[PDB]
Design an enzyme around this catalytic site. Sequence first.
Site, mmCIF file in Angstrom:
data_model
loop_
_atom_site.group_PDB
_atom_site.id
_atom_site.type_symbol
_atom_site.label_atom_id
_atom_site.label_comp_id
_atom_site.label_asym_id
_atom_site.label_seq_id
_atom_site.Cartn_x
_atom_site.Cartn_y
_atom_site.Cartn_z
ATOM 1 N N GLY A 167 0.811 -1.202 0.000
ATOM 2 C CA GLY A 167 0.000 0.000 0.000
ATOM 3 C C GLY A 167 0.848 1.256 0.000
ATOM 4 C CD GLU A 191 16.430 -14.028 28.593
ATOM 5 O OE1 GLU A 191 16.500 -13.766 29.813
ATOM 6 O OE2 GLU A 191 16.369 -15.195 28.155
HETATM 7 N N1 GTP Z 1 -3.104 -9.976 5.404
HETATM 8 C C1 GTP Z 1 -3.755 -8.878 5.032
HETATM 9 N N2 GTP Z 1 -3.284 -8.128 3.974
HETATM 10 C C2 GTP Z 1 -3.939 -7.008 3.586
HETATM 11 C C3 GTP Z 1 -5.090 -6.599 4.246
HETATM 12 N N3 GTP Z 1 -5.528 -5.466 3.658
HETATM 13 C C4 GTP Z 1 -4.686 -5.150 2.646
HETATM 14 N N4 GTP Z 1 -3.702 -6.103 2.584
HETATM 15 C C5 GTP Z 1 -2.565 -6.144 1.644
HETATM 16 O O1 GTP Z 1 -1.932 -4.877 1.624
HETATM 17 C C6 GTP Z 1 -1.536 -4.524 0.312
HETATM 18 C C7 GTP Z 1 -2.195 -3.202 -0.064
HETATM 19 O O2 GTP Z 1 -1.888 -2.224 0.905
HETATM 20 P P1 GTP Z 1 -3.037 -1.527 1.786
HETATM 21 O O3 GTP Z 1 -2.739 -1.626 3.259
HETATM 22 O O4 GTP Z 1 -4.360 -2.174 1.481
HETATM 23 O O5 GTP Z 1 -3.078 0.001 1.279
HETATM 24 P P2 GTP Z 1 -2.832 1.228 2.288
HETATM 25 O O6 GTP Z 1 -1.860 0.848 3.372
HETATM 26 O O7 GTP Z 1 -4.139 1.669 2.890
HETATM 27 O O8 GTP Z 1 -2.224 2.413 1.386
HETATM 28 P P3 GTP Z 1 -3.142 3.239 0.351
HETATM 29 O O9 GTP Z 1 -2.635 3.065 -1.058
HETATM 30 O O10 GTP Z 1 -3.071 4.704 0.701
HETATM 31 O O11 GTP Z 1 -4.567 2.753 0.438
HETATM 32 C C8 GTP Z 1 -1.952 -5.668 -0.599
HETATM 33 O O12 GTP Z 1 -0.856 -6.514 -0.870
HETATM 34 C C9 GTP Z 1 -2.994 -6.409 0.207
HETATM 35 O O13 GTP Z 1 -3.020 -7.779 -0.119
HETATM 36 C C10 GTP Z 1 -5.570 -7.347 5.311
HETATM 37 O O14 GTP Z 1 -6.586 -6.998 5.908
HETATM 38 N N5 GTP Z 1 -4.898 -8.487 5.701
HETATM 39 MG MG MG Z 2 18.479 -14.210 33.423
#
Ligand code: GTP
Ligand code: MG
Lengths: 427, 440
Positions: free
Chosen positions: B143, B254
């Site tokens: 993201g 640790e």
């Molecule tokens: N395991 C897991 N992965 C997630 C989840 N939500 C998004 N992802 C992963 O995160 C990546 C995308 O990043 P995001 O966190 O969704 O986007 P962001 O951090 O909000 O950044 P923006 O572009 O501003 O939206 C992709 O590879 C998704 O598969 C979640 O709830 N669980």
């Molecule tokens: Mg100790």
Amino acid sequence: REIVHIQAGQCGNQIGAKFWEVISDEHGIDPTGSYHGDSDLQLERINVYYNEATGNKYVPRAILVDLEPGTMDSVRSGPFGQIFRPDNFVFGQSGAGNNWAKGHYTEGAELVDSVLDVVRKESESCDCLQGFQLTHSLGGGTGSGMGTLLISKIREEYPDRIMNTFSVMPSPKVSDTVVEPYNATLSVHQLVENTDETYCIDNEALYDICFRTLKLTTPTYGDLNHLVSATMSGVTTCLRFPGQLNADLRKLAVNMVPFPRLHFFMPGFAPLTSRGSQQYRALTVPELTQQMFDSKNMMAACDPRHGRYLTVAAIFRGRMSMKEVDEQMLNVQNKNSSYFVEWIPNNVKTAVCDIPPRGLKMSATFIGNSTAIQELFKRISEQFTAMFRRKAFLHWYTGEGMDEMEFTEAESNMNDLVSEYQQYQDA
Amino acid sequence: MRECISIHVGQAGVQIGNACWELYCLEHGIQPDGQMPSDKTIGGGDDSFNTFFSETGAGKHVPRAVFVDLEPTVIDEVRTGTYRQLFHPEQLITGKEDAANNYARGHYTIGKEIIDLVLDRIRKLADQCTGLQGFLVFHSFGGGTGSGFTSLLMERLSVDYGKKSKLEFSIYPAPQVSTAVVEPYNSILTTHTTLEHSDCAFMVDNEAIYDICRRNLDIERPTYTNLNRLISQIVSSITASLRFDGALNVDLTEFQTNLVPYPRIHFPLATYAPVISAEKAYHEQLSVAEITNACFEPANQMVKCDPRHGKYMACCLLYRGDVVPKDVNAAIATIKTKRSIQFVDWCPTGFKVGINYQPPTVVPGGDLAKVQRAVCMLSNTTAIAEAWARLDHKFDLMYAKRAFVHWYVGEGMEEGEFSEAREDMAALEKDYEEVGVDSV
Ligand SMILES: Nc1nc2c(ncn2[C@@H]2O[C@H](COP(=O)(O)OP(=O)(O)OP(=O)(O)O)[C@@H](O)[C@H]2O)c(=O)[nH]1
Ligand SMILES: [Mg+2]
Ligand SMILES: Nc1nc2c(ncn2[C@@H]2O[C@H](COP(=O)(O)OP(=O)(O)O)[C@@H](O)[C@H]2O)c(=O)[nH]1
Ligand SMILES: [Ca+2]
Ligand SMILES: [Mg+2]
């Protein structure tokens, strides 16, 4: 002749508390600090370790030190937790993270002055302070790093007093972290220079005894500390009860240390026993003498046949034939005279004490200054080098301001110590 | 004391935060309104669970946590969800416009507008601490917020909190649930920027988690909800030593001593067992030996790689539940004489062990069977570098043609930042190669 006791770090406080527990029972002192014994032998020299208080209450001349409150809170709630003087509890909050540098240079340097204020307060009550004894491990951060810092500063303020230590050596068989060889090597450097007497208590030997001999499948620290407390009681017997031999810390040093750096002792003990396991058969004197000399009974994982005894102190406890003792002691020397250096005549000394320890009708504690102890330091040096040649895990130390050169010096000094022990093995 | 502050960044960080904090509450018997009947010290305390929860006079146990996202719709669900009473409104921070899968927007354009507000809210938690240990940062690699804003925050945290420890839980991208073609770019940029500022980072390969949900729980098409509930169990296992006490309990710091031989080599491989459905767990008890042996089945790793073709620099076992040292030692002795376990020559081979007697917990309506004992292995293997290799290759394919680079340049970035970041990754791959070579 008063002794000031100090226990530093997790290990130091856990064996330190167990030590006060054991000898308090021997001196007839209950957790309240009240005497309830039937022999006057118990109180004759109780001033060595205990301060006399109101209502004829006895209070350990002990100072408890740590960079975290965890273990010391366990001590204060332990069996004899209340006997200790509450003002002598000196602790930080940050811990040392099994890091010698943190204990010696940063975290511990912040706390050390508070500790020395208590040491000083205790020392001025003493009619004639003979010295200090420290309990600690060399594998962690506090006991190892801050403990040796304390030693250095105590020597500065009391340079004419004896410094004694019970130093627990690290072992991979009983290991908390990979950097124990680093912490230990840095500590041995300090100990070689700033102590007169060090009891080398090897966790390797304590483990092997529990496993191989006591048939404990999976020994705990509690099991290991059964052996340590038994050994600590014995090696201090001559200091706690009336006698003519090795009665103070200086006379012990003069009899045990032919050369100032070679002051690292192998403790031994017989009979070996596990916790709870009741012994019904009392050992004969020949049996005590044979066992206390066997490698299987040494608290330092060294083969005494791989070296030579410079000096030996032996202390038999219980009701026994002092003639049989002298006979058997002379027999060991006369049968195995090769394992005693010929250029120190009559280097084996024996004491006897009527009071046995708890649970045993008789026992023998061994204190040997053998050149074979080099095997202990060689072992640490090999583990040290394996990591250091790749500068592995060093960032934990450089982050506290340490330079690599200081490791190199420590390494070199321990290897020098080894070669010194080797010099006299071939004399 | 020893408080830990959790910071959940972006959708992935936040939604994993939801799973973790829901799970913590059930583990500690904390209700959705924050009340904890078993806790008799009202308004404060020095208990182990206080490392993660603060206490109000009204008896509410409040997460030492901040939620941050540059768009409001994910955190809004927290604000209106089951555990909305759990968080003070100031712990939940949102902008109006996300980073659009763009590191540049997350680190610069959009992120700089909210960074100061975030640091102020973090400061407010820290000043309530009597002995702050460090931070735990949850975020995705892919993201724009997870990558860009996280790296900005980590930089700023190093300035405001010196060498105070900073741990990462990083979500490594997988194509089965990917959201952007440029996630390799974002991955390399944030890894490069955060490397100096992180002390220890636990990577979670979404594909690894995806496969485990499919193979071990028989979930045809895993959702984020499926993944996160599994992830939260691994996170719980890792933080359990901080949140609970016990004789055989070993603190995470640790383990950390053993896991990080050099500063840059701070990426442990996590392996968790048992992951099993209720249907299969019925009338079937997995012993200590079985779950321990499962830690050396690569199918159970949080990151796809083959440790059997690498070298170990550390091996830690974090047990929880009905476990005693005897059984652990027996299981380890068996494993060492049957597995492909090889250490580098400059490190000892002993396995470091921790046990928390508090048994594993599961969330209602979840796919995981409730078991009496679980284990999370934390190992330091050269093989984890394979994850870097795959990401770096995908990076190279696009960057050779400068595909999508104009989206980054348009937001003020320079191509020099891409090349600098990639060079650092190449040095990191070489580092992991160097540590595996035998000493001379
Ligand atoms: N395991 C897991 N992965 C997630 C989840 N939500 C998004 N992802 C992963 O995160 C990546 C995308 O990043 P995001 O966190 O969704 O986007 P962001 O951090 O909000 O950044 P923006 O572009 O501003 O939206 C992709 O590879 C998704 O598969 C979640 O709830 N669980
Ligand atoms: Mg100790
Ligand atoms: N015999 C014994 N050794 C211990 C004990 N606790 C720790 N150790 C050993 O000491 C080293 C760890 O040092 P520790 O005392 O925990 O560090 P510190 O608290 O910072 O001083 C390791 O080599 C352990 O095996 C104990 O209770 N008994
Ligand atoms: Ca409370
Ligand atoms: Mg988003």
